[PDB]
């Protein structure tokens, strides 16, 4: 109904802002299974911006918190897989800092 429609539109607005930040490049699409099988040996709940966008468009987020859990996991996955000294880890920190207030405002 209208609450789910409104929520979808708000989530897509957050993902739009997310996707245009310089620190978003590592997170735009799923990690290639072909290129990086070892990634999926460590990360068992993968996600990325494109997958969240497609899920949102198709109504797969029933509540704000369902989206929040997956958005948080995107950053947590990077900081589990990659070392603290990598640019990826730093970009995860920078991007989460930027986006979390937008998420809370939903």
């Amino acid at each position: 109904g209208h609450k789910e429609v409104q929520l979808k539109d708000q989530i897509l607005g957050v993902l739009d802002y997310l996707e245009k930040q310089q620190s978003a490049w590592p997170f735009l699409k799923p990690v290639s299974l072909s290129e990086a099988p070892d990634y999926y040996d460590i990360i068992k709940e993968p996600t990325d911006i494109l997958t969240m966008r497609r899920k949102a468009r198709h109504g797969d987020y029933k509540t704000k918190e369902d989206f929040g859990i997956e958005l948080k996991r995107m950053f947590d996955n990077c900081r589990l897989y990659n070392a603290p000294t990598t640019i990826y880890f730093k970009y995860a920190n920078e991007l989460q800092t930027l986006i979390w207030p937008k998420y809370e405002a939903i």
Side-chain angles (χ1 to χ4, degrees):
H2 77 91
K3 298 182 85 95
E4 291 162 325
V5 174
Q6 181 183 323
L7 173 65
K8 169 182 62 181
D9 293 339
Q10 289 181 268
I11 289 171
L12 290 169
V14 170
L15 293 170
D16 287 344
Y17 179 74
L18 190 67
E19 194 181 323
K20 62 199 251 294
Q21 307 306 312
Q22 192 253 311
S23 51
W25 286 101
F27 311 107
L28 295 176
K29 77 188 189 310
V31 171
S32 170
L33 174 62
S34 177
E35 295 171 342
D38 296 353
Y39 179 81
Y40 290 103
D41 291 335
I42 297 306
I43 298 306
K44 296 302 179 184
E45 297 179 77
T47 184
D48 62 274
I49 297 170
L50 172 63
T51 299
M52 289 188 275
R53 178 176 301 274
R54 298 192 73 200
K55 283 175 73 170
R57 289 203 291 247
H58 290 279
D60 287 344
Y61 300 117
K62 305 303 194 243
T63 67
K64 165 183 176 173
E65 290 70 30
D66 295 311
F67 171 57
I69 289 165
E70 188 165 0
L71 182 63
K72 186 162 67 187
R73 193 158 56 230
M74 185 181 81
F75 299 115
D76 293 346
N77 284 343
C78 175
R79 292 187 292 251
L80 173 60
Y81 193 70
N82 301 286
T85 47
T86 61
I87 52 170
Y88 307 143
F89 195 109
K90 291 171 189 171
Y91 290 153
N93 283 342
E94 177 177 8
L95 190 60
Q96 189 165 15
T97 302
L98 285 164
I99 205 63
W100 215 257
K102 307 296 199 190
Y103 165 76
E104 286 193 338
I106 293 176

